[PDB]
Symmetry: C3
Subunit: 406 residues, 3 copies
């Protein structure tokens, strides 16, 4: 069973390219794509149950103090890694010199308030991850306070509620395992459709864009995550071997949230992270991780700027990327995200997006490879989420070391 | 208490006809109808709790293999009965020669993917039955797998979750029983309003339409269901006696889903079907049963075709009905359904529905008796659902025979 | 810790007036207001969990007969107090002679049906209090019926479900306590923003309107509630001392529903009311209490009538207020409510609300102090809710007397 998913990925990508190159991507859309859509839905089904129950259990299992420390540690991690992602975006974008073709040429306060759900049942029904995180944490904390109270009735009620959440989480993890028996087929179908539709379009300048973007992701992995793991004494090759199922699922599904059941099962079975850490850190990182955004914006912004011949200094590119990143924070992984955010960035600087204009043209070109860019963006984000979770668990002594030894 | 509902039905229907015939149906709308609306809402309240909890419990109570066999058996049953419904629709429509008045004259793939909920809390809040069925089944299965695991903590969590669902289901069935103390009043009020508004309109050609339609339903009952029950060794007269509360409730409420709490209580208390069978088969059949649709479309399509003098061969009528049935699958029982589907069918063949046209006129005439047709459609559908559930339970040895013996 | 909230209120109100008087209310909107919005959201988070679980537990704890008696007692109470509120509205409005400036110059049946939820999960997700009350009551009743049944499996399932709801309620009350450690800051921020924006606008005629309105509220408290408490043998000064946290929270949040977790914790910890009483009476009173509405409409209607010089007899004012009250019943406490209802009342009598008209002008003037009027409206409503809850609990012998004795 082991390694079957990576075969699924490679075979799907080859089939997709061949089918697209020979004209048949339309038939693929009809016949192949539904198996991958099914894989994606099966994983989505589990997100709210597993996230709620796992975080209620985790926040019960852990002291408020330690939970606060885990929060601050993981946020510092995500800041570090997003800073690196901005750097590598600027660097690799300029090295590849993307866009050598020729044309003519603050609301964050309410986002924080919105962290607190006004109706937790509504946030569950609407699939809002961050407020569910908040309610689960507060419920877990309250539950442990009640379970230390003297009156036995209170203790027994709290234990029953906690067991209901524990049972739900357990059932979800089991279902994830079952779905992961299916995962290779889904991965094949998704990468096949993407390759058949947009792979053939990666050529000429856009190939250098895709290469540039993927180079940036590669560096973010092999430099930032590996060095951070080594500094804290984790073998990065063992890490990758254990992360592989989460990484490939992130790649193909293009959703940090949709991979969560898989990422959490990998953190439990493979990484050996305690639920008190990953049940909190992973859903949070799925919504706050800004590495892929910084990389996408840096590269695609440079490509666009060069396509219309607008001069852009390194500092000006940096300020633009940073303001785009600030506008992006809090948004979870969703397909077609960075393209929309890029369109917003272009609009806000006063550029003419009316049909026929050069900028509308460069944007459409990016938009047509956007799926190819999103796969890598999501894969590097989920990778960084697992890395930071493992690191924090280690610093909190919640990492099981036996899993990391051949 | 027993048989009180059937008195409610007959008395309500008489009162409704008299009130309508004498002009007073408007007063009925004001004063009488709310008691029936209340009955309908009280039953609706129970659908999601009882369906979720009953199916979680049932799928826990039964092995995956047996559950698969129950699924395939009940689907084969619904195919058989829909084929018969098409036949009887064509036959009875032509025998009555409906419409002797004179005027001038594929997206199923996404429906299957949509079977899988992406947010089960969302599907519960939105009242989507089929995805709730899916999640409950998978949860039940997962729960039983965990309850056979060695670790006691896992077993105890799973048992607590399963008991929560069992308690909810039990509470729902008790509430159903209480509501069924009220049922005769609700049945009276509903049939009274319907008779007062549209009963008086069943005369002349439309009476032959109503007669024709009701004849088709009658045959579907007394031929298809009775013969199928006898082949498998169930007394059909005992069956009807036990089904009577579900049949009348289906008749008056015009909703397969809204009758579900009653249909399930009848299957438990009267039919003696195990929850492992009916908690699955009945909610599924409420959304996939196509007998009433085939009958409605066959008759009303023939009536319309004759009204505008458009020649329609038996094979052409069959192909039209079949494509309407394919378009209808997956839609649960809802008032005003077949009228909309008929309107779609008329539009798709290129007919002119603009005001004043002959087809708009014939459609309005059907629309005005549509409630009268819907009552029968829903009653025959719920009857067929109970019949197929009982049959499958028998073939699985999950039917308690002591209930069927005087 | 005790009395800290009342300091928060007074200090916030002073800061707000000074900031507004000196121009800086805009900065307040940016910097100060979010802390109060956070307080409001933190309380809102708890409404559905605590209301559901508390009412399931309460209706389990109490017999159906006693629950019916509690219902009828509390409704009679709310009728009495709304009649008094109408009286005091007319009286105080006329005494202050509001509006001495000079210009040119039934659907209740469906509301009752809507009490019954058609999908209780939907009503939880949508935050509909009254249908959640209904489902919780019926669930509690059903649960106690099952727990008296002979079969132990049924008893154990019902007990598990009831314990899940009890644990949730307990966790909510604990969280409320924690939030109430924070309450003074929130109260400060809210009253500060309101004073800075609209306090400065209370001058001249509008000051007499505000005074008039607040006088009416004062009377409703010191006459109706005090006399009713004394008749039944409750010390009204002890009552106020115990109610103070609920009263101030109601004042600042301007939401009966949003204060519910606080009102219920006050009823439990301070008043000593059994959950069987207050878990039902308080959420119901939050949606049906009509005292503030009668007062608001009486005063603002008189002010408007005098501003445009339209002659209004005392009986005509009474009929208008009564029809507005009938239109208002069932609506829970929400900011900006009475202004909308007043606008409806003005429209329905045929007045010209087109821009520039005198009535549009008087309405805009009320609208600009509407927040100042809403604070008092909500505070008097929550006060009356606690008073009636305590009274009913006493008549049912569910009030703990030890809490009322120094
Ligand atoms: C996203 C950045 C991090 C967000 C926040 C951290 C993560 C979530 C909350 C954890 C508990 C934090 C509060 C409880 C722990 C603080 C210390 C404690 O134990 O009690 C505090 C109390 O107010 C006096 O001791
Ligand atoms: C609507 C038509 C029917 C829909 C489908 C049936 C009803 C619902 C599912 C039942 C369990 C089906 C899967 C589990 C049972 C299959 C055999 C089994 O026990 O295990 C399968 C496993 O993959 C190797 O053994
Ligand atoms: C808002 C005005 C009040 C609304 C209604 C009251 C409050 C909610 C319901 C309580 C139980 C009422 C029904 C159960 C109690 C009635 C007597 C009883 O115990 O049983 C009734 C049974 O039908 C023959 O005995
Ligand atoms: C590893 C999986 C391979 C798929 C993802 C990799 C990046 C996008 C595909 C690379 C571009 C394909 C070559 C372009 C072409 O055929 O003209
Ligand atoms: C390109 C995909 C990134 C992950 C794999 C390469 C880096 C880590 C490794 O060498 O195993
Ligand atoms: C059995 C319950 C009776 C109601 C349902 C039966 C079919 C619709 C009513 C039959 C038509 C009524 C007669 C028409 C008329 O009075 O002119
Ligand atoms: C017409 C209603 C259909 C049900 C009753 C008639 C058929 C079965 C029976 O004879 O009892
Ligand atoms: C007690 C808390 C005080 C705030 C609520 C009281 C009523 C509204 C404020 C009273 C009007 C302020 C004076 C008007 C002015 O300064 O010109
Ligand atoms: C004005 C606020 C109303 C409450 C306080 C005054 C009345 C009761 C009291 O005197 O304590």
């Amino acid at each position: 069973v082991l390694w079957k998913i990576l075969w699924g990925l490679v075979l799907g990508a080859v089939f997709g390219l061949i089918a697209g190159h020979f004209g048949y991507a339309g038939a693929v859309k009809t016949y192949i794509k539904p198996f991958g859509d099914l894989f994606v839905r099966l994983l989505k089904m589990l997100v709210m149950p597993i996230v709620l129950a796992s975080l209620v259990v985790g926040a019960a299992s852990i002291s408020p103090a330690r939970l606060g420390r885990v929060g601050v540690k993981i946020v510092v991690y995500y800041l570090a890694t997003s800073a690196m992602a901005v750097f590598f975006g600027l660097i690799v974008g300029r090295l590849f010199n993307v866009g050598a073709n020729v044309n003519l040429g603050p609301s964050l306060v309410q986002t924080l308030l919105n962290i607190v759900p006004t109706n937790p049942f509504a946030s569950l029904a609407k699939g809002e991850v961050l407020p569910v995180i908040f309610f689960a944490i507060i419920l877990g904390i309250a539950i442990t306070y009640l379970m230390n109270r003297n009156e036995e009735r209170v203790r027994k009620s709290a234990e029953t509620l906690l067991r209901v959440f524990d049972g739900l989480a357990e059932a979800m993890y089991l279902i994830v395992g079952g779905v992961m028996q299916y995962a290779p087929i889904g991965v094949f179908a998704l990468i096949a459709y993407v390759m058949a539709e947009q792979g053939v379009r990666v050529v000429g300048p856009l190939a250098k864009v895709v290469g540039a973007v993927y180079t940036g992701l590669f560096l973010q992995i092999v430099i930032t995550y590996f060095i951070l793991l080594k500094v804290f004494g984790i073998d990065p090759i063992k890490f990758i071997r254990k992360a592989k199922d989460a990484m490939i699922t992130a790649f193909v599904t293009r959703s940090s949230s949709g991979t969560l059941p898989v990422t959490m099962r990998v953190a439990e079975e493979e990484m050996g992270v305690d639920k008190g850490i990953f049940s909190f850190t992973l859903p949070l990182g799925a919504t706050i991780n800004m590495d892929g955004t910084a990389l996408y914006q840096g590269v695609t912004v440079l490509f666009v700027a060069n396509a219309i011949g607008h001069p852009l200094t390194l500092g000006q590119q940096l300020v633009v990327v940073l303001t785009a990143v600030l506008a992006s924070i809090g948004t979870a992984g969703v397909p077609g995200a960075g393209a929309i955010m890029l369109a917003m960035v272009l609009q806000s600087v006063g550029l003419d997006l009316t049909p026929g204009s050069p900028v509308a043209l460069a944007y459409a070109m990016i938009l047509g490879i956007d799926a190819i860019l999103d796969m890598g963006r999501t894969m590097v984000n989920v990778t960084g989420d697992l890395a930071g979770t493992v690191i924090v668990a280690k610093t909190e002594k919640e990492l099981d070391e036996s899993k990391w030894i051949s």
